[PDB]
Amino acid sequence: SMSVKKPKRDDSKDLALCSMILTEMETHEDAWPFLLPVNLKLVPGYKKVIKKPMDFSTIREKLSSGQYPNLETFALDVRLVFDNCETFNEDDSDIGRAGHNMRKYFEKKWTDTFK
Numbered sequence: 001s002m003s004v005k006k007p008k009r010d011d012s013k014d015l016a017l018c019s020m021i022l023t024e025m026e027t028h029e030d031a032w033p034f035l036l037p038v039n040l041k042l043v044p045g046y047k048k049v050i051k052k053p054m055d056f057s058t059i060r061e062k063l064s065s066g067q068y069p070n071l072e073t074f075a076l077d078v079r080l081v082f083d084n085c086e087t088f089n090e091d092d093s094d095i096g097r098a099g100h101n102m103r104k105y106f107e108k109k110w111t112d113t114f115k
Contacts, residue, residue: 014071015063017071017113017114018063018068018071019063020113021106021110022060022063022078024109025078025105025106025109028105030097030101031098031102033085033095033099034055034081034099034102035055035056036056037053037057037058038053045088050087052080052084053084054077054080054081059074059077059081062077079106081102082099082100082102082106085098085099086099
């Protein structure tokens with residue numbers, strides 16, 4: 001509350017550390033469904049169904065331009081990529097499997113770097 005604060009957690013390296021995670025997600029062999037925005041002209045149904053599209057290149061641009069206020073808003077966009085994927089793709093598809101694989105990969109790096 002006013003003039004009552006928990007001890008200050010050091011967030012000075014968060015930007016660099018999120019950038020490292022994102023580089024590792026970009027270079028994963030199963031990243032290909034997620035590298036670029038889904039083409040809303042060429043994929044019927046995507047625009048109407050997926051209210052907030054997100055992909056690794058859009059996260060990269062937001063990160064590089066100071067559009068994440070803190071490390072939690074970064075994680076929320078990474079999770080959105082995978083949540084969108086599950087909304088539009090069957091679990092038993094190459095893309096559906098890729099999304100589960102990458103969500104796991106992310107959640108481990110997140111826990112090991114920050115928790």
